[PDB]
Structure formats: structure tokens, C-alpha cells
């Protein structure tokens, strides 16, 4: 599914996603927009390591999902990677939280990093009602 901006705004909201661990919504929402297009389907395949980035948020199988195909990787989400290629972003929405419990917290996304860091994200709510 790809979503419309002000549609996944909220529903961002409605998962609790607003303001997780000092992260905006904006925040969350430019992520998406560099990462997918805010298309859930989207997928990226790393020759170089053999890894694949799953989902809306483009989350790794290297670290947070099981692929069964990606060397000696882990799985701190305890989530087929299929679960972050589903309309319903809910899972996919629990394994992003996963991710910014983590240290880095949101800079664990380097497009967050190259596209979102010091810059106005303002844009990316304005008229969404969130």
C-alpha cells in the first residue's frame, strides 16, 4: 500500500508513534518519505552483504527481521521480515520503535540522517489534524 501523507500521519498517531522516545511525527514521516515513498511494499536487496531492507521504513535484515536468507543475521524484532510488507503497519511500526530504543535511536537511518536531520520537517504534517 502506498499511503497518502495526511493517512499515514495519522495513523502514525494512532499508533503511539507521536513523540516515542523524543521522536516527532514529522520526524517519523520524513523517514518514511526518503525510505519507501510511504510504500509498504518496498524492498532493497544489498548485494554487497546480502542483506534486505523490508517495508515503509525500510528496516534491515541484517539486525531486525528474519528473512532466513541473510548471514548470520539477527532478529530484534521477532518478526518474519514478511510482517513489514503488509498494509497494516502496525508490526512494522513495533519493529521501528525496537529500533530507536536502541542508542542511536532515529539516526539509526542514515536517509533520516541525509534528508531529516536540522532541517524543517514542519511540511510533512501541516493540514494533517495530528
Same mark, same amino acid.
Given at each position: 500500500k502506498?499511503? $497518502?501523507? %495526511? $493517512?499515514?500521519?495519522?495513523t502514525?498517531?494512532?499508533? =503511539?508513534?507521536?513523540?516515542? @522516545?523524543?521522536?516527532?511525527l514529522?520526524? +517519523?514521516? %520524513?523517514?518514511?518519505?526518503? $525510505?519507501?515513498?510511504?510504500?509498504?511494499?518496498? *524492498?532493497?536487496?544489498?548485494? =554487497?552483504? @546480502?542483506? *534486505?531492507?523490508?517495508?515503509?521504513?525500510?528496516?534491515?535484515?541484517?539486525? +531486525? %527481521?528474519?528473512?532466513?536468507? *541473510?548471514? =548470520?543475521?539477527?532478529? &530484534?524484532?521477532?518478526?518474519?521480515?514478511?510482517?513489514?510488507?503488509?498494509?497494516?503497519?502496525?508490526?512494522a511500526?513495533? %519493529? /521501528?520503535?525496537?529500533?530507536?530504543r536502541?542508542?542511536?535511536?532515529? @539516526? /539509526? +537511518?542514515? &536517509? +533520516? @540522517?541525509?534528508?531529516?536531520?536540522?532541517?524543517?520537517?514542519?511540511?510533512?504534517?501541516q493540514?494533517? =489534524?495530528?
Amino acid at each position: 500500500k502506498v499511503f $497518502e501523507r %495526511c $493517512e499515514l500521519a495519522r495513523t502514525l498517531k494512532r499508533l =503511539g508513534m507521536d513523540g516515542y @522516545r523524543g521522536i516527532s511525527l514529522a520526524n +517519523w514521516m %520524513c523517514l518514511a518519505k526518503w $525510505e519507501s515513498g510511504y510504500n509498504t511494499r518496498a *524492498t532493497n536487496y544489498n548485494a =554487497g552483504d @546480502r542483506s *534486505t531492507d523490508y517495508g515503509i521504513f525500510q528496516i534491515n535484515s541484517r539486525y +531486525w %527481521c528474519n528473512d532466513g536468507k *541473510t548471514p =548470520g543475521a539477527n532478529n &530484534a524484532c521477532h518478526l518474519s521480515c514478511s510482517a513489514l510488507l503488509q498494509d497494516n503497519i502496525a508490526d512494522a511500526v513495533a %519493529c /521501528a520503535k525496537r529500533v530507536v530504543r536502541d542508542p542511536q535511536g532515529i @539516526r /539509526a +537511518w542514515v &536517509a +533520516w @540522517r541525509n534528508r531529516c536531520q536540522n532541517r524543517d520537517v514542519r511540511q510533512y504534517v501541516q493540514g494533517c =489534524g495530528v
